[PDB]
Ligand binder design. Structure first.
Ligand SMILES: [Zn+2]
Length: 124
């Protein structure tokens, strides 16, 4: 299972990507929360909004405070990222800002499948 240095080293790389420096939902700076489901970075407020969606629509974990990351979850973050998600969503007909509408979209459904596949494929 990944250790602290492995987790921290990886998120330093990922959060250094400029497109990962703005919350996926609201654009707020320096998002430190993740929805593993979509491989996206969220600000603390939006992390709370995602909690109301429920774990089957969005699985939330801190990239800073929480060290319960497994390799699959880390790889979802790596194969994902905010740029990839933003492109996929618009390209599959979803530019809704409202979280309930956005995460029940056909695009969100297709994307969580894509993330699982790519994340799985990313494992050694
Ligand atoms: Zn936000």
């Amino acid at each position: 299972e990944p250790n602290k240095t492995e987790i921290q080293t990886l998120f330093k790389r990922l959060r250094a990507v400029p497109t990962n420096k703005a919350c996926f939902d609201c654009g707020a700076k320096n998002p430190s929360w993740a929805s593993i489901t979509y491989g996206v970075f969220l600000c603390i407020d939006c992390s709370g909004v995602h909690r109301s969606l429920g774990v089957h629509l969005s699985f939330i974990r801190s990239t800073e405070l929480d060290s319960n990351w497994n390799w699959f979850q880390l790889r979802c973050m790596q194969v994902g990222g905010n740029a990839n998600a933003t492109a996929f969503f618009r390209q599959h007909g979803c530019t809704a800002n409202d979280a309930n509408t956005k995460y029940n979209s056909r695009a969100a459904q297709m994307y969580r499948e894509k993330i699982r596949q790519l994340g799985s494929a990313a494992l050694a």
